[PDB]
Write a protein that binds this ligand. Structure first.
Ligand SMILES: N[C@@H](Cc1c[nH]c2ccccc12)C(=O)O
Ligand SMILES: N[C@@H](Cc1c[nH]c2ccccc12)C(=O)O
Lengths: 283, 295
């Protein structure tokens, strides 16, 4: 890559919580982000902007593949759209993120040069989002209401804390480039957090950044596996009712084993902050 | 001049009237019932945060349309790539209308100005939704450990008045066309306007209001918020084209264009309005209004 240290950080952050995230949830943020003797707002500003910024980073990355857009032209779009987001995160608990954003805007000798710079920093901010999504205290709501049987690839999903294991197939002929990439990042262990809005689903931020085409997408089948590129290269498992691309599905027999993992990854995300880890592997 | 006249009619109505989409988020009457486990606070958390940052996206894309170093088929593809993931979520999270106008802003445009009007109008429609959203959002829910104007020609400074009602507090201020010619005139052109006044939640003691205008004019005089005097007046193009009054010490370090300052005689009156607009944003949700008029 153009800056190797970021990949080093990426590898450490799938296993460990970023010191930055640590400082924000604790209220140790330097420059005391927050107004009137509280830091909750600054924390809400940290989680939101790191997420949407991530979404922008990812779309800018997709944009960097379009050759109907100049490389310096894309440089300008980033130079316009980025500082308003980076500078604030610099002040609100995301300083090193700023320095790298200043770096993606540096002149690229190759279209590949920007594309790689984006992908590293995107994945780095996408990890940061994931951890931010893990620790934000959403528990204040007060607010109470086809294919080929040959191309299915055998995979195993496991939650060490829960001790639950499931088998599943990845359809490598429905979304070909998408499955290729996810497969290449298998085996991986990541954190498993819950979906706070759409419903009884969960997602885990995969260790990849793919702009792969998504010709086959579906309604957001119990135990469905879907990969959301736009929202952070997340692998998504559906243990209940809640259009995203389809990677495959957990076997109907181990479909009943998801429910207790659903409750435990919902409490993982809502109240406990007690990590549920997901390992995906190829059998 | 306008290819979105009905958006303009919405923009006028919402300066005074709470928007309906915002009403459904704060009461919890949204047809998707967004959120999980039977709560809306997270959906609330997501529509507010995303509508704010969706507006920052629209504004930098309005800023991009004024750039002629970027073709418009290239501008439109950028808009066609960044917008959908935000707006469609806004379509699901309480903002159906914003989603459709978003489909319309990205249609092929015969003239740069055609795209530029779309962005400018749309920016302002979202900027008022963000505005009411920042007012009604429940921040009352994590506490910390307690333990420049010399430049330019005063001969050109323009006096204006700021009145906050139903408080009835009045202070006299000056705008400096010398410091920021286009920025100052843009706010002076918007004058007079009476808008909702809210407090700023992160940058110390400071309150801002969504000025009913979208200025893309680059600013030649910025100042660090933390090194900014009591009474200072700031215009944030990027965070909603708002008018921002510094009434206390601010933690932020991010430069903001200088618009002018409240006169030394009446700066005392600022301390009492801040405490008030604080709860106006944090607790009561009592609609303070700021009227600015030329003197
Ligand atoms: N809000 C969804 C996730 C999601 C889907 N699309 C999005 C777009 C933007 C932000 C978040 C999302 C959840 O947490 O259940
Ligand atoms: N600190 C501001 C918010 C803010 C300032 N600069 C920003 C840049 C991007 C996003 C948000 C902001 C407040 O008090 O609310």
């Amino acid at each position: 890559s153009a800056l190797p240290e970021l990949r080093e950080l990426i590898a450490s952050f799938v296993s460990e919580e970023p010191p930055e995230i640590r400082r924000i949830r604790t209220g140790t943020v330097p420059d005391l982000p927050g107004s009137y003797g509280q830091y909750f707002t600054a924390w809400d500003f940290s989680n939101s902007i790191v997420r949407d910024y991530a979404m922008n980073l990812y779309q800018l990355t997709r944009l960097a593949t379009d050759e109907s857009v100049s490389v310096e032209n894309l440089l300008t779009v980033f130079r316009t759209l980025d500082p308003i987001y980076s500078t604030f995160l610099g002040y609100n608990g995301f300083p090193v993120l700023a320095e790298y954003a200043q770096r993606v805007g540096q002149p690229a000798e190759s279209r590949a040069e920007l594309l790689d710079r984006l992908t590293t920093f995107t994945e780095y901010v996408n990890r940061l989002t994931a951890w931010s999504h893990h620790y934000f205290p959403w528990d204040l709501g007060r607010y109470r209401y086809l294919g080929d049987p040959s191309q299915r690839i055998p995979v195993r999903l496991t939650w060490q804390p829960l001790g639950v294991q499931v088998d599943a197939e990845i359809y490598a002929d429905l979304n070909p480039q998408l499955a290729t990439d996810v497969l290449k990042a298998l085996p991986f262990t990541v954190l498993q957090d819950h979906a706070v809005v759409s419903g009884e689903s969960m997602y885990a931020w995969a260790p990849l950044v793919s702009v792969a085409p998504t010709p086959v997408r579906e309604r957001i089948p119990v135990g469905r596996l879907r990969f959301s590129q736009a929202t952070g290269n997340k692998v998504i498992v559906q243990y209940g009712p809640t259009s995203s691309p389809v990677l495959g599905k957990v076997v109907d027999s181990h479909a009943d084993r998801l429910a207790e993992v659903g409750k435990a990854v919902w409490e993982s995300t809502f109240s406990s902050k007690e990590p549920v880890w997901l390992t995906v592997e190829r059998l």
